[PDB]
């Protein structure tokens, strides 16, 4: 018997607003100048956004427009009124970004596991499915009374590595003041969010019949986002990745262009791990890549299969080194990373996404691995 809990948040959570604004600036610059170098951090607090950092780009028009990119992103998230705690059209926006016209000892991790169709650990996969659906029923008008800020927590009970029970689900969501928590919110969330996600997943062993469901356990949640709070870019890196189930090297993703190895190699490592698992080489795998200063190619590639391998782990390591080219330049080319694809990654997780198609989630190396093992 083990319990494992992971968490996700909606795009309206103040830290996630920051990640999305940072990545929205990044996408605007890449769309006009694919070689842009970008290190952009966002802060939010009551009624203000502060965007800072450094850019090297030829995309002068997009750079000029950053103030409008900020506002439009916030509006798209759904903050369009002080009654909601925040209004993208009228909040303060301050830009302190340095602008110009035109490496590491490292140990990066990737992970995949056959507990879900998307090959992610179940607690985080379910938490992200729930937070994404919470947003979906607001935006599609099914529960139009919802507001952007929200959080999901999923606790799974395991016996001998098998997920056997959905122990607890917590869903906190912002909403209009006049909504009855017990008569309206609780059954609507159970029906439109929890039940539809569980149906979608159709898990083979997860028994959800006795789940303890807590919807807004602390009561009314009328104001949200930056209101009476603060958020920063890169403060949800466990939410962005594997929900605590896998190890983390420490780099945040959002607001960084693909030349930042923190981002692109983390994406490659997910890609490698996912294809290893999808190929049938192991039921779960953590993949490690070792980099050296002055060398482009890795100096080490190590697999941990936690006893779950179907073949010698040393053979898996050799097959990876044969199939994948993990030089940064090769990664950037092969995953086609110099494109404005990043704003969608800034909430609901960078890995295992069921609603968007990301290059590092493609199972396009399964055949190659099978031929090389």
334 belongs to the catalytic site: no
Distances (CA, A) of 120 to 126, 219, 286, 365: 9, 32, 12, 18
| 8 A C-beta contact, residue 29 and residue 36 | yes
Chain breaks in the chain (C to N over 2.5 A) after: 102
139 belongs to the catalytic site: no
Strands 146-159 and 300-304: unpaired
247 belongs to the catalytic site: no
191 belongs to the catalytic site: no
Q: How far is the CB of 153 from Ca ion (least distance, A)?
A: 15
Residue 367 interface partner, choices Ca ion, a copy of itself, none, CB cut-off 5-8 Å depending on type = Ca ion
**Taking the CA atoms of the chain, what radius of gyration do you get in angstroms?**
21
Show Cβ contacts of residue 68 under 8 Å, excluding neighbours closer than 6 positions. Answer: none
Q: Which is nearer to a copy of itself, 116 or 153 (CB)?
A: 153
Rounded Cα distance, 174 and 219, in Å: 10
13 belongs to the catalytic site: yes
Q: Which is nearer to a copy of itself, 51 or 272 (CB)?
A: 51
Which of 65, 229, 283, 317 lies at the binding interface for Ca ion (CB under 5 A)? 229
Residue 368 interface partner, choices a copy of itself, Ca ion, none, CB cut-off 5-8 Å depending on type = Ca ion
Q: Which residues pair with 40 in a beta bridge?
A: 53
Residue 234 interface partner, choices Ca ion, a copy of itself, none, CB cut-off 5-8 Å depending on type = a copy of itself
Q: What angle do CA 259, 73, 271 make, to 5 degrees?
A: 35
Q: How far is the CB of 370 from a copy of itself (least distance, A)?
A: 26
Q: Which of residues 343-372 bind Ca ion (CB under 5 A)?
A: 367-368
295 belongs to the catalytic site: no
| 8 A C-beta contact, residue 156 and residue 163 | yes
Owner of token pair 């890795």: 298
Q: Which residues pair with 288 in a beta bridge?
A: 109, 302
Asked if residue 151 belongs to a known ligand binding site, the reply is yes
Q: Which is nearer to a copy of itself, 105 or 141 (CB)?
A: 105
151 belongs to the catalytic site: yes
Residues contributing to the site for a copy of itself (CB under 8 A) = 1-7, 39, 41, 43, 45-46, 48, 50, 52-54, 96, 98, 103-107, 109, 153-155, 168, 170, 214, 217-218, 228-230, 232-239, 244-250, 252, 290, 292-294, 299-300, 302
Give the residue closest to Ca ion by C-beta. 229
Dihedral of CA 223/227/229/234: which sign? positive
256 belongs to the catalytic site: yes
Helix (H, G, I), strand (E, B) or coil at 35: coil
User: What φ, ψ does residue 150 adopt, rounded to 5°?
Assistant: -175, 165
Q: Which stretch binds Ca ion (CB under 5 A): 24-32, 98-106, 203-211, 226-234?
A: 226-234
Please tell me which residue in 138, 175, 260, 270 is annotated as part of the active site.
260
304 belongs to the catalytic site: no
User: What φ, ψ does residue 48 adopt, rounded to 5°?
Assistant: -145, 155
Please tell me which residue in 71, 236, 270, 274 is annotated as part of the active site.
236
Q: Which is nearer to Ca ion, 65 or 368 (CB)?
A: 368
Q: Which residues pair with 214 in a beta bridge?
A: 170
Q: Which is nearer to a copy of itself, 92 or 144 (CB)?
A: 92
Helix (H, G, I), strand (E, B) or coil at 248: coil
**Which residue ranges make up the annotated binding site for K(+)?**
41
Q: Which residues are catalytic?
A: 13, 15-16, 41, 54, 151, 221, 229-230, 235-236, 256, 260, 262
């Amino acid at each position: 018997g083990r319990l494992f809990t992971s968490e996700s948040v909606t795009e309206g959570h103040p830290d996630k607003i920051c990640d999305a604004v940072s990545d929205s600036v990044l996408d605007a610059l890449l769309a006009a100048d694919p070689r842009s170098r970008v290190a952009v951090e966002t802060l939010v607090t009551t009624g203000q956004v502060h965007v800072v950092g450094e850019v090297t780009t030829t995309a002068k028009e997009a750079f000029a427009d950053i103030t409008n990119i900020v506002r439009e992103r916030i509006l798209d998230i759904g903050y369009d009124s002080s009654d909601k705690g925040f209004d993208g059209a009228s909040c303060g926006v301050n830009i302190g970004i340095g602008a110009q016209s035109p490496g590491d000892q490292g140990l990066m991790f990737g992970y995949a596991i056959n507990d879900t169709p998307e090959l992610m650990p179940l607690p985080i996969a379910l938490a992200h499915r729930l937070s994404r659906r919470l947003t979906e029923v607001r935006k599609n008008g099914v529960l139009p009374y919802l507001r952007p800020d929200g959080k999901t927590q999923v606790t799974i009970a395991y016996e001998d590595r098998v997920p056997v029970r959905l122990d607890t689900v917590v869903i906190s969501t912002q909403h209009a003041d006049d909504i009855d928590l017990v008569k309206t919110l609780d059954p609507d969330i159970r029906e439109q969010v929890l039940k539809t996600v569980l149906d979608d997943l159709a898990h083979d062993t997860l028994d959800a019949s006795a789940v303890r469901v807590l919807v807004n356990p602390t009561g009314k949640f009328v104001l949200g986002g930056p209101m009476g709070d603060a958020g920063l870019t890169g403060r949800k890196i466990i939410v962005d990745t594997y929900g605590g189930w896998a190890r983390h090297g420490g780099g945040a993703f959002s607001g960084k262009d693909p030349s930042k190895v923190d981002r692109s190699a983390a994406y490659a490592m997910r890609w490698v791990a996912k294809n290893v698992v999808a190929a049938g080489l192991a039921e779960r795998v953590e993949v490690q890549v070792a980099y050296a200063i002055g060398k482009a190619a890795p100096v080490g590639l190590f697999v941990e299969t936690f006893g779950s391998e179907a073949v010698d782990p040393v053979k898996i390591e050799k097959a990876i080194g044969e199939v994948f080219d993990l030089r940064p330049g090769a990664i950037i080319r092969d995953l086609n990373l110099l494109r404005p694809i990043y704003a969608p990654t800034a909430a609901y997780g960078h890995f295992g996404r069921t609603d968007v198609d990301l290059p590092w989630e493609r199972l396009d190396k399964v055949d190659d691995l099978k031929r090389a093992i």
